[PDB]
């Protein structure tokens, strides 16, 4: 008795046909990176983040601030490039 995946399966994207023409990470480290990025996305299956308390998860922040200082993007950029 099969069920139907809800949303995307993780590796369903890449082509199994013609594996030799696919680029691999021969680095352990590249893999580690890609994996840690994958572990930060909001998946549809029971996950560690879910049970172990991301602490309210998504939260819309009521902000009582002082307004952020207004500074010119392009000017600053130019000056820094120069420096």
């Amino acid at each position: 008795r099969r069920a139907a995946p809800l949303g995307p399966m993780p590796n369903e994207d890449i082509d199994v046909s013609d594996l030799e023409r696919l680029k691999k990470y021969r680095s352990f480290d590249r893999y580690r990176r890609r994996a840690e990025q994958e572990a930060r996305k909001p998946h549809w299956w029971r996950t560690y983040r879910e049970h172990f308390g991301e602490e309210s998860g998504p939260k819309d922040r009521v902000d009582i601030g002082l307004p952020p200082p207004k500074v010119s993007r392009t000017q600053q950029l130019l000056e820094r490039k120069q420096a």
Binding site: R2, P5, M9, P10, N11, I14, V16, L19, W45
Partner: peptide, 19 residues
């Protein structure tokens, strides 16, 4: 688990051919 939607999530061997 076969009954579940998440079945075969850990399936890899089709990605690497070593035979």
């Amino acid at each position: 688990y076969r009954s579940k939607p998440t079945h075969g999530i850990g399936r890899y061997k089709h990605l690497v051919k070593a035979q």
